[PDB]
Amino acid sequence: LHKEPATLIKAIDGDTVKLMYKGQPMTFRLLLVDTPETKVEKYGPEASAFTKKMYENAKKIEVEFDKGQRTDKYGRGLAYIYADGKMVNEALVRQGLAKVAYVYKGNNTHEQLLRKAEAQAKKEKLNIWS
């Protein structure tokens, strides 16, 4: 896998974000994560606030496509996204603001990494795990 540059256009919520990728606006859906929905579930706005701060505060944003299908049925890019080298997908799981989702069409490269972050958040009874 490889990281590609991107520019934040607009935070949207916990599991999606609008980025300028290769000169064109595109909305991305974070791979392997399920956050609380606010459009308003418990820890829904928390999760949104979290990724919002992460994207807006970063100097560098990178998108990393996995090895499976690159876009879902709704035209959203499916990737692991990084803010200054830190993976937003993992950060959410680790903060207990999202659960690990089932693998989607072969995109499972970071499944174990996220599974561990999640086990740790659960152990700490963090947020969603309260």
Short mmCIF file of C-alpha atoms in Angstrom, two decimals:
data_model
loop_
_atom_site.label_atom_id
_atom_site.label_comp_id
_atom_site.label_asym_id
_atom_site.label_seq_id
_atom_site.Cartn_x
_atom_site.Cartn_y
_atom_site.Cartn_z
CA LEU A 1 0.00 0.00 0.00
CA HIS A 2 1.08 3.59 -0.45
CA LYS A 3 0.15 6.95 0.98
CA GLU A 4 -0.92 9.66 -1.44
CA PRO A 5 -1.22 13.36 -0.63
CA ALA A 6 -4.62 14.95 -0.11
CA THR A 7 -6.04 18.27 1.08
CA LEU A 8 -8.96 18.58 3.44
CA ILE A 9 -11.90 20.34 1.82
CA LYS A 10 -14.39 19.79 4.62
CA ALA A 11 -14.85 17.53 7.66
CA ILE A 12 -18.21 15.75 7.46
CA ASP A 13 -18.49 13.32 10.34
CA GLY A 14 -17.02 10.34 12.13
CA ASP A 15 -16.73 7.95 9.19
CA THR A 16 -16.46 10.31 6.19
CA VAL A 17 -14.53 13.39 5.06
CA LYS A 18 -14.30 15.54 1.91
CA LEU A 19 -10.84 15.69 0.43
CA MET A 20 -9.20 17.13 -2.69
CA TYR A 21 -7.54 14.06 -4.11
CA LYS A 22 -5.47 14.44 -7.27
CA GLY A 23 -7.05 17.79 -8.03
CA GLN A 24 -10.65 16.70 -7.56
CA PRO A 25 -13.08 16.91 -4.61
CA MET A 26 -13.96 13.47 -3.35
CA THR A 27 -15.64 12.19 -0.26
CA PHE A 28 -13.96 9.30 1.55
CA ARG A 29 -15.36 6.60 3.77
CA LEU A 30 -12.86 5.33 6.39
CA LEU A 31 -12.04 1.67 5.95
CA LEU A 32 -12.86 -0.88 8.64
CA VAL A 33 -14.59 1.47 11.07
CA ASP A 34 -18.20 2.00 12.24
CA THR A 35 -18.80 5.23 14.17
CA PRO A 36 -22.00 6.34 15.93
CA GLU A 37 -24.33 8.11 13.48
CA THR A 38 -25.54 11.62 14.25
CA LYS A 39 -27.69 12.09 11.13
CA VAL A 40 -27.90 11.48 16.84
CA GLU A 41 -26.52 8.27 18.38
CA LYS A 42 -24.55 7.99 21.63
CA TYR A 43 -20.96 9.21 21.06
CA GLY A 44 -22.02 10.25 17.57
CA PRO A 45 -21.05 13.93 17.91
CA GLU A 46 -17.97 12.98 19.95
CA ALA A 47 -16.65 10.88 17.07
CA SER A 48 -17.36 13.71 14.60
CA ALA A 49 -15.67 16.27 16.80
CA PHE A 50 -12.67 13.97 17.09
CA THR A 51 -12.04 13.47 13.36
CA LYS A 52 -12.93 17.12 12.66
CA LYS A 53 -10.10 18.30 14.95
CA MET A 54 -7.76 15.68 13.55
CA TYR A 55 -8.17 16.70 9.90
CA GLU A 56 -8.28 20.47 10.41
CA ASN A 57 -5.24 20.55 12.73
CA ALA A 58 -3.02 18.39 10.52
CA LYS A 59 -0.24 19.87 8.41
CA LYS A 60 -0.37 16.85 6.08
CA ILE A 61 -3.22 14.54 5.05
CA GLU A 62 -2.63 11.34 3.17
CA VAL A 63 -5.00 8.78 1.76
CA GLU A 64 -4.05 5.13 1.54
CA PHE A 65 -6.15 2.82 -0.62
CA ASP A 66 -6.16 -0.81 0.41
CA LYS A 67 -5.87 -3.80 -1.97
CA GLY A 68 -9.60 -4.40 -2.44
CA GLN A 69 -12.28 -2.32 -4.16
CA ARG A 70 -11.44 1.42 -4.00
CA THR A 71 -14.95 2.96 -4.06
CA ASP A 72 -18.23 1.90 -2.48
CA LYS A 73 -21.59 1.92 -4.28
CA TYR A 74 -22.14 5.56 -3.32
CA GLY A 75 -18.97 6.76 -5.04
CA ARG A 76 -17.01 7.28 -1.84
CA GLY A 77 -13.31 6.41 -1.84
CA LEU A 78 -12.53 3.59 0.61
CA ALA A 79 -9.25 4.24 2.43
CA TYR A 80 -7.14 4.53 5.57
CA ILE A 81 -6.53 8.20 6.11
CA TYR A 82 -3.56 9.75 7.88
CA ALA A 83 -3.17 13.12 9.61
CA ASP A 84 0.49 13.92 10.12
CA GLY A 85 1.39 10.25 9.93
CA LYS A 86 -1.34 9.18 12.39
CA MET A 87 -4.06 6.92 10.99
CA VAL A 88 -7.48 8.44 11.70
CA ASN A 89 -9.17 5.00 11.38
CA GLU A 90 -6.99 3.56 14.18
CA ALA A 91 -7.19 6.69 16.36
CA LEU A 92 -10.98 6.48 16.40
CA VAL A 93 -11.02 2.82 17.31
CA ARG A 94 -8.31 3.35 19.97
CA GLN A 95 -10.27 6.24 21.50
CA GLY A 96 -13.30 3.94 21.68
CA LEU A 97 -15.25 6.24 19.32
CA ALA A 98 -15.81 3.55 16.71
CA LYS A 99 -15.92 -0.20 16.40
CA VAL A 100 -14.06 -2.27 13.81
CA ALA A 101 -16.36 -3.07 10.85
CA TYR A 102 -16.46 -6.33 8.89
CA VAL A 103 -13.92 -6.60 6.07
CA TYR A 104 -15.26 -5.13 2.81
CA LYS A 105 -14.30 -6.63 -0.56
CA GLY A 106 -10.74 -7.59 0.38
CA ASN A 107 -9.75 -4.37 2.14
CA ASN A 108 -8.34 -5.97 5.29
CA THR A 109 -4.71 -4.93 5.42
CA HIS A 110 -5.11 -3.10 8.76
CA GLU A 111 -7.81 -5.27 10.25
CA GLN A 112 -5.61 -6.76 12.99
CA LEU A 113 -4.06 -3.44 13.93
CA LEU A 114 -7.55 -1.97 14.40
CA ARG A 115 -8.77 -5.11 16.20
CA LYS A 116 -6.03 -4.59 18.80
CA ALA A 117 -6.70 -0.84 19.23
CA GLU A 118 -10.34 -1.83 19.79
CA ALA A 119 -9.59 -4.57 22.33
CA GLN A 120 -7.53 -1.99 24.22
CA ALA A 121 -10.29 0.65 24.22
CA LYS A 122 -12.77 -1.98 25.41
CA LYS A 123 -10.43 -3.02 28.21
CA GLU A 124 -10.27 0.64 29.28
CA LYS A 125 -14.08 0.85 29.01
CA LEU A 126 -13.42 3.98 26.97
CA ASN A 127 -16.36 6.04 25.68
CA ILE A 128 -18.51 3.72 23.58
CA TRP A 129 -17.30 1.00 25.92
CA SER A 130 -18.53 2.85 29.02
#
